[PDB]
């Protein structure tokens, strides 16, 4: 199933969200959907969910949705909820948002945070467009 990254934070793909059972076992209360095409699981309250409507491409901008994204994760840990960040495959888009979240909360650089997520979920390979943007985010922080 989906990969635990942190306590209360999971990183996965759409097959993970659509799987009622797996979702019930991990405790997935919230959903950050990072795709235009992947639908919300019939079982998540709208308010408990978030789409970050981005494509997996070289021209897409996923930097301006970063702040929003981390807050949504933070907010959901405050209510003591468990968040699944996903997109179609959990390889590029969602992995990018997870890493940004790691960078912020653990005071890590891109290189460090990428390695942190990569060790837990070895299939991650965000494109260089997203990685360049994450470097730009490293600066803001």
């Amino acid at each position: 199933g989906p990969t635990r990254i942190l306590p209360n934070l999971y990183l996965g793909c759409q097959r993970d969200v659509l799987n009622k059972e797996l979702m019930q076992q991990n405790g997935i209360g919230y959903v950050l959907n990072a795709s235009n095409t992947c639908p919300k699981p019939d079982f998540i309250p709208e308010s408990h969910f978030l789409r970050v409507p981005v494509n997996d491409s070289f021209c897409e901008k996923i930097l301006p949705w970063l702040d929003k994204s981390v807050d949504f994760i933070e907010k959901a840990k405050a209510s003591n909820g468990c968040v699944l960040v996903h997109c179609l495959a959990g390889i590029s888009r969602s992995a990018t948002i997870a890493i940004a979240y790691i960078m912020k909360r653990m005071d890590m650089s891109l290189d460090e945070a990428y390695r942190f997520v990569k060790e837990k979920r070895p299939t991650i390979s965000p494109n260089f467009n997203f990685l360049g943007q994450l470097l730009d985010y490293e600066k803001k922080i």
Binding site: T123, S125, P126, N129, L131, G132, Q133, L135, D136
Partner: protein, 317 residues
Amino acid sequence: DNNFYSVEIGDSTFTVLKRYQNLKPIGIVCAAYDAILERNVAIKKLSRPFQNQTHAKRAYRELVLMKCVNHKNIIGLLNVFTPQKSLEEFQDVYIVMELMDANLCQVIQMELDHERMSYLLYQMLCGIKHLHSAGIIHRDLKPSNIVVKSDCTLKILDFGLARVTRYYRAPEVILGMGYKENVDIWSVGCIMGEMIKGGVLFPGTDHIDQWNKVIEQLGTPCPEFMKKLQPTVRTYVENRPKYAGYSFEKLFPDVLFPADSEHNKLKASQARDLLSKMLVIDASKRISVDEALQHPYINVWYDPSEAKELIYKEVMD
């Protein structure tokens, strides 16, 4: 032809024409004996290829391309069918092709002379030239989608990408740049290199890692090249440690080549030269397929004296 039967192959069911006999596994592809041609053939099943918008467009292209293309170094189409009788019934497509004896992964692993490496590369390049001449750039050329016969003939199985194993993709693809024909030349270089070295040139589990092996070996691209990248890719790439890289003499020494070959010192320098012109990060300075075919290492082989309603629609032709 309406004569169909079924066999359980592993976990799947193949339902094929009676002419195809004694199926054994090797999409899911099994081997069969074609009773009407008196030779073995391959049968590839495409199951619910319209399971989505994607499988559809890749299947339709492959299916169209396979039908209108034909060359000696591209796998030959023998047949196409669906065991289903209607457009509603429509579920699966079967592609019958000629069957080779091994894939290039296996062959790489064997003990090859210069003469055989040259011949495999030469065939590869003709296959590609033919594709480019038809306006097809492959962009996904790998040892696993190239098959070869016992006598060393080489066929290319697929037509590549539209418009996990990432080791043979050109830098242009990783860097989000535009590409042209010689993109496929980078893949050929990788394969060539693999054949000589005895292992994958740039083995990686993601883009970062891919790039890394690339620059660790060939060297960080010059500033002029960095400036060709879109701003974001450029900021990521310019942030990575610099590497000097190694000369092609150090990357591909004589010892790597088969040891007792006639004229191998010259043959190894020809191979190194060809490699040095193929594994070039800047595609505008990388050789073309036509220049490659004319290279001393390859040119021995030139002979002057010789020469969903849609899918379903396309299956019923």
